[PDB]
Design a protein around this ligand. Structure first.
Ligand SMILES: O[C@@H]1[C@@H](O)[C@H](O[C@@H]2CO[C@@H](O)[C@H](O)[C@H]2O)OC[C@H]1O
Ligand SMILES: [Cl-]
Ligand SMILES: [Cl-]
Ligand SMILES: [Cl-]
Ligand SMILES: [Cl-]
Ligand SMILES: [Cl-]
Ligand SMILES: [Cl-]
Length: 433
C-alpha cells in the first residue's frame, strides 16, 4: 500500500502530442485491405473515443528512389530533376490518408521527414546511401521550402513540421543520406535559415533525427547564433539507446521529439511488449522531459516483427492489433496537444511508474500508472491543489484493451486503486463543470 502525490501547481513541459507514420507505401497497404478495414484501422489509430488518438502524423517526403517494391518502397519526388518540378499529388500515396484523418479526426500536426534528397543532389547519384553534394545545399533548401509552400498552395495540405534528415548517421539499403553535425550547421546557417526567412516559412524544423537518442547532431547548430533561429525541435530516434537529458537543447528553450522507435528484432505482440513501450514514454517524459513521442508505423504489412502497432496480412486481407497500440493509447488518447505534465510520485513502489498531465485550458487531467512487475500493488493517490469528484479508469493488460472501468469516487482529494500485475491504468477526470 503505497502513496502517489499529484501536484496541480508543479508543472513541467508542454506535450505536443504522439505520432505514427505510414511511410514506404504502408498508407496504400491499409487501403488494399478494403474500405471497411481501412476505416477500422484509421479508427484504431486516431479516434479519441475508441482508438489511440494519435495527434501527430509522420510521412516521407518523396525522393524518387527506384529501390524496394510496391509493398515497401519509395515514392516519386515532386522535383525529379533540377530543372523539372512535377506537382502531381499521385506521387505521394500518403495524401489521401492525410486528408481523411485531418477531416475525420482533426489530426492537425503533419510532420514530413526526408529520408534522402533526390538522386540528382546526392554524391553517389542515388537516394540509397551517400551524402548531399555541397554544391546542392541551396537546391535542397529550396527543395524543402517549395514543398511546404506547394503542399499547401497545390494540394491543400499544411505541413506544420519539416524533418530535414532521417538518421543522418546511417547509410542503409533504402532511402538514406549521411551528414556530419558540421555539415548540418552549414546547411542551416547558410542555406535553410535565409531561404526559409525569404519564403516566410512558418513550419517548425525537426532537426536531423539521429538514430540514437542524443543531441550530438544538434549541438553544433544549437550553439550557432544563426542556425539556432530555426532549430525549433531536436528530433531523435531511440534505436539501441536509452533516455537521457538533452542539456543544450533545454538550455536553448527548444523542443524534443522522439520521432521513431519500434522492435525490429523480435515479434512480441503481448502485454510485455506493450509495457516496454509504455515505460519508454514514462522515461521520455521524466528523464528527458520531451514533448512528443512516436512509434514507427501505425499499421504495416510486416507480420514478423514489431515495426508497426497493427500487423496487416496482405494475402488474407486481415489485420492483428498488438497490445502496444493500447498501452501507448493510455497516454496518447487522453494527453492532447497543449497539455502539460505535472508532478506525480514517479516511482511509488518497485515496478510502478506514474506520470500526470493536465489541460491548462479546460481543467481536464490524466494520471498514467504502469505496473510492469509480477505483484498486485495497492496505490493511494493524493491530489494536491485540486479536488475532482471522481476519476474514470482505463486499463490495458493481458485481457484488457483500453478498457473503461467503473468511476472511482474521489474522497477529499484521495482515491485508491489496485494496479494489476503487468498492466497500465490511466485515471481521467475534470475539475471544471
Ligand atoms: O521496410 C523498411 C523498414 O524496415 C525501414 O524502417 C526503418 C527502421 O529504422 C528506422 O530508424 C528508419 O527510420 C526506418 O526507415 O524503412 C525502409 C523500409 O523499406
Ligand atoms: Cl525527398
Ligand atoms: Cl539516413
Ligand atoms: Cl504489444
Ligand atoms: Cl515515426
Ligand atoms: Cl510485434
Ligand atoms: Cl484537450
Amino acid at each position: 500500500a503505497s502513496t502517489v502525490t499529484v501536484d496541480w501547481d508543479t508543472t513541467y513541459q508542454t506535450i505536443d502530442g504522439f505520432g505514427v507514420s505510414e511511410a514506404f507505401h504502408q498508407s496504400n497497404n491499409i487501403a488494399r485491405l478494403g474500405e471497411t478495414k481501412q476505416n477500422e484501422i484509421y479508427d484504431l489509430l486516431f479516434s479519441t473515443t475508441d482508438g489511440a488518438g494519435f495527434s501527430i502524423f509522420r510521412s516521407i517526403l518523396g525522393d524518387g528512389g527506384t529501390w524496394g517494391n510496391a509493398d515497401d518502397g519509395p515514392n516519386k519526388t515532386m522535383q525529379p530533376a533540377e530543372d523539372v518540378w512535377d506537382w502531381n499529388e499521385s506521387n505521394d500515396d500518403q495524401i489521401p490518408m492525410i486528408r481523411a484523418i485531418q477531416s475525420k479526426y482533426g489530426v492537425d500536426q503533419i510532420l514530413y521527414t526526408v529520408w534522402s534528397p533526390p538522386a540528382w543532389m546526392k554524391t553517389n547519384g542515388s537516394v540509397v546511401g551517400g551524402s548531399l553534394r555541397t554544391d546542392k545545399y541551396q537546391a535542397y533548401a529550396t527543395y524543402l521550402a517549395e514543398h511546404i509552400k506547394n503542399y499547401k498552395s497545390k494540394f491543400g495540405i499544411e505541413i506544420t513540421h519539416i524533418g530535414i534528415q532521417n538518421e543522418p548517421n546511417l547509410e542503409t539499403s533504402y532511402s538514406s543520406c549521411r551528414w556530419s553535425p558540421e555539415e548540418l550547421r552549414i546547411f542551416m546557417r547558410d542555406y535553410l535559415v535565409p531561404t526559409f526567412d525569404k519564403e516566410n516559412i512558418t513550419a517548425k524544423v525537426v532537426f536531423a533525427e539521429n538514430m540514437s537518442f542524443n543531441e550530438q547532431y544538434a549541438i553544433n547548430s544549437l550553439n550557432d547564433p544563426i542556425a539556432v533561429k530555426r532549430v525549433d525541435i531536436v528530433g531523435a530516434h531511440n534505436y539501441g539507446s536509452s533516455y537521457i537529458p538533452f542539456t543544450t537543447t533545454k538550455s536553448k528553450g527548444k523542443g524534443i521529439w522522439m520521432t521513431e522507435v519500434s522492435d525490429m528484432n523480435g515479434n512480441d505482440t503481448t502485454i510485455n511488449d506493450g509495457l516496454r513501450w509504455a515505460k519508454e514514454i514514462h522515461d521520455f517524459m521524466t528523464i528527458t522531459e520531451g514533448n512528443a513521442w512516436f512509434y514507427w508505423w501505425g499499421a504495416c504489412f510486416k507480420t514478423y516483427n514489431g515495426e508497426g502497432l497493427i500487423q496487416m496480412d496482405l494475402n488474407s486481407k486481415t489485420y492483428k492489433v498488438a497490445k502496444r497500440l493500447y498501452t501507448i493509447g493510455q497516454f496518447s488518447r487522453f494527453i492532447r496537444p497543449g497539455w502539460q505534465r505535472i508532478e506525480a510520485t514517479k516511482n511509488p513502489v518497485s515496478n510502478v511508474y506514474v506520470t500526470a498531465y493536465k489541460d491548462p485550458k479546460t481543467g481536464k487531467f490524466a494520471i498514467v500508472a504502469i505496473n510492469n512487475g509480477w505483484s498486485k500493488q495497492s496505490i493511494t493517490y493524493t491530489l494536491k491543489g485540486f479536488s475532482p469528484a471522481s476519476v474514470t479508469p482505463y486499463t490495458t493488460s493481458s485481457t484488457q484493451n483500453l478498457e473503461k472501468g467503473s468511476d472511482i469516487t474521489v474522497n477529499n482529494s484521495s482515491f485508491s486503486f489496485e494496479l494489476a500485475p503487468n498492466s497500465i491504468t490511466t485515471f481521467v477526470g475534470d475539475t471544471e463543470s
